[model samples]
Target: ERPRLARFLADDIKAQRVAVEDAVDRSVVTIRGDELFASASASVRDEFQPLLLRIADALRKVKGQVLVTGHSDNRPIATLRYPSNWKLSQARAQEVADLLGATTGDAGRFTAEGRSDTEPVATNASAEGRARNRRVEITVFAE
Candidate 1:
């Protein structure tokens, strides 16, 4: 029921105002940190739940290794819950993995990873760049 696997997920994710990178043999879906949670929190936005569920449903049919990676800006957080940015990133990734694994029927199909601000996509100097750096990526690859 899927024509192109990456495009399938990319299309749905993009519809939710998320960013998508669909290419041959690979797919990378990006969502901003604000989209999933507020500052210093791991709770997913209520508005995003339905979209995430739909994505999980679609993902159930795809064939690939799903890796949910979390990223943040270089700015440090002073919250007690997450002592470091890496911990916060990992918590976010794990939260996303929990949702995706719900409908995938295979818990091991998705892996949660956290890189903190180490692998930033943009500079942390400006707010826009910081937002870009504070993104979560779901990458899928097969073959």
Candidate 2:
């Protein structure tokens, strides 16, 4: 992977709480989950569009696909719109992809995934931990 691409991604992606990590073949951007949307909804905070556009612009320069994954807490949610955590999370993920696609101008370059608490980063028993567990990760592949 061209580590300079990592630097390119890291430069503009700073200042936000988002975490940037570059691996052997990809760069990862991780953000606290709930920051993007209101509770139990798929709509993103439109204020984030500026930052998201910055990311999408960077992604435009990359050759590999971008994967946006949505995560949630273990607490089950049963509603008409979101009968399960998986659907809710997937919807949230797709919303993000949609946002990026608006700037990337290529829908084929994105993939949205939902983990729905299966891969928790912290203890669900704690409040902040559950919040921490709910996160979004955007991986820029350098293939």
* Per-residue lDDT of 54 in model 1: 57
lDDT for 116 in candidate 2 is 91
Q: Please provide, for model 1 over 17-70, each residue's C-alpha lDDT reduced to its tens digit, 9 standing for 90 to 100.
A: 477666676667788887778886767888878766756765656677788999
Model 1 spans > 4 angstroms off: 1-16
Highest-lDDT candidate: 1
Give candidate 2's error at residue 116 in angstroms: 0.9
TM-score of each: 0.85, 0.85
Give lDDT per model, in order: 0.77, 0.77
**Model 1, clash count?**
0
Question: Which RMSD does model 1 reach against the true structure?
Answer: 2.7
